[PDB]
DNA sequence: TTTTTTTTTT
DNA sequence: TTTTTTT
């Protein structure tokens, strides 16, 4: 039987005390209201899990109050008693980078940033392969890097393209009716697909990512 | 004043879904009144996740498993968007390894349970006394100061109340104990984790403020 | 132009005050930090402005502690003073409906879930239209109302058959190549539309509400 | 041994469904990465659910999608397979009241309200008993109902005063010493209450909330 | 086309 | 990647 997890999420290290105490109290909402346990019992057993992860993140790891934390430790309740299995106890860390470094780096980008959030993306492609159908699959990328995929259909005597990419940012290529003989397909993709995405919607990361294996799944 | 976009903590994996969200959920009013279409707002998040994309992955050289917050302000005019970049704030948490923490962990997860029963020392110092001759006492845990305390003599009784942060919050209700004036100093050095023993757990904040409550009378 | 926003989102009306208090400190982490403001000014103005909260909630819309309410709120930051434009104050209220008039409902129901829980959604379908280059778009729908959308593209003896429904739960038929000849579109369409979706995809809403018009924006 | 539940806690009708999804698989997200489950198995049982509560929230509770809800229910995972346990579920609803219903009552309250903000929180109070060591607490009232307590600790011509309310705003009356005879205590508390408060500190509900039972639990 | 909404804080 | 988080 899976036992119930007591996770804090991401939490600056000088807060994670009153974030395991609130999401453990939330938790045990019912059993409180029940009568399976107290507001005691449950402070009380928040508590004695706060006074361990004090000796584990300030002592142990050194972990500065200005770091992020991320804790989560599964938990039982039997017969009126809150019980921790710190066998499944797992914590995450990450450390601070100095405003010093940080600051005069966002400030100079900064002053570049007007430029570039107009500035249209421009991508390169290559064939990945085509279907049984005859559909043409395509990845896209960014800089080198791969960030997407594309597929283009051709019909009768014109192409019908969508696509999809990550990053910079991810966006969605609705089917769209390009002016194309099947004939001009491969010269096609490379000379328009940055000029494509030019008008492409702005989605969430998820849904891009979706038709990215929707698409290269095909292959 | 402007409006400021808030991310909060997010992994960098996903901060552009963060930016996306945050800004539709600040600008819902003005799209229902159709001072802005969805179009616009998503081409203002997706712009400006392009330009965080060179920020955090190029310039900052941030790994997608790291920790990111951003806040930048913006303003609304005449149906667009515009962000003001001299307000552009990012911070950075970088990512620990798992094989420098999970067996710090690992070890420790056995002496949990040994740690837990075993009560909290803490050690006193005289700070000073109030205007009515309440004495408060600085409460310190493994030599760092993490609490106060303050007793208030009577004839033959005291009243004792204080408050700790660390290791954990915790709050002693106003108690009475029999002990002459003469020999409470001696008392409290004896007795203080005695007391926090069977103390309240608390929140950070509650435990914070009643420490300096007491801190604030000298 | 327009003015930074405090937003309570939904909270229940017993606890607006600590949600009014927390994202007033979170958007004015700043200005204290930078020292325009200190954490007195900004807990002053909470509390003032939850006071006077506390009388439009109780006095004026009568709500009770257990309601559920949505608070928003312009303001800007003067001389090391904050100051709320009350014009732009918006409340929402949503009045609780009584356990006494749910649970039973919840409960009979509870008896009957987990055998509707294996249960195969039976889909209907409407032809929509064709698209310029052939394809054809039905609306899906679901005990008489439109959930979903899906399109067909013709091809030699074969077809590809997209789809995805909202309601009632979000489905997306992956792209799927079926044996039909094109004369027989529309009898398979409509013959099959509940079995396709039988081994479709759980995906979110957003995720079907999109692909729905992405398929019905190519007949409109 | 009791089993994780799943809680979505408030959302809007009409966006159950995804929220139902994510908290289910923020929760089972180890589950996923162990190889226990695959994101297959969590995302048909997220929608398994969401197709059983359509039909409660839509069909049986006559839900509108503005309104708000709250869903939480058990589930148990054994052997790679996730179970719902139905017996369980709790499905709380809150019906919305039209904009046209409120938005003028809020309007008008807006004209009144920067004058209503300046104003000092008008309270009473009233004797509840004494402690052992001669405190008096009183209990401190709001529109007639209580909100708050107050103890005072007597001394030499002088007093000690400390309290806190709840409503409409919670607040917290740092130990104060005064001027007042122990025999006028009683008639310096009852004019002196409200105005003590003005100057009183602007804090978190459950602050003022924990300061009032430990004053209330020293009476006899 | 959604039709509701996508946060910060916790 | 994804949440809960005062009756």
Redesign the pocket.
């Known amino acids: 039987a899976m036992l119930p997890?007591l996770?804090?999420?991401?939490?600056?290290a000088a807060?994670y005390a009153?974030?395991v105490r609130?999401?453990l109290?939330?938790?045990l909402?019912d059993a409180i209201?029940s009568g399976e346990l107290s507001?005691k019992d449950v402070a009380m057993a928040a508590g004695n899990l706060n006074r361990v992860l004090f000796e584990l993140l300030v002592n142990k790891l050194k972990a500065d109050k200005l770091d992020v934390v991320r804790i989560?430790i599964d938990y039982e309740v039997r017969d009126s008693q809150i019980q921790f299995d710190f066998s499944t106890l797992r914590v995450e860390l990450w450390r601070r980078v100095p405003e010093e470094e940080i600051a005069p780096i966002v400030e100079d980008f900064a002053r570049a940033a007007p430029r570039l959030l107009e500035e249209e993306i421009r991508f390169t492609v290559e064939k990945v392969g085509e279907t049984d159908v005859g559909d043409v699959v395509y990845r896209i990328m960014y800089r080198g890097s791969d960030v997407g995929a594309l597929i283009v259909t051709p019909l009768n005597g014109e192409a019908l393209v969508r696509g999809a990419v990550v990053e910079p940012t991810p966006l969605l290529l609705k089917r769209t009716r390009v002016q194309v003989e099947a004939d001009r397909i491969d010269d096609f993709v490379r000379e328009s697909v940055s000029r494509l995405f030019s008008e492409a919607q702005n989605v969430?990361?998820?849904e891009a990512?979706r038709v990215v294996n929707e698409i290269l799944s095909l292959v």
């Open positions: 997890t996770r804090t999420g991401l939490v600056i807060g009153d974030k609130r999401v109290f939330a938790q909402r209201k507001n989560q969430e990361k998820r990512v």
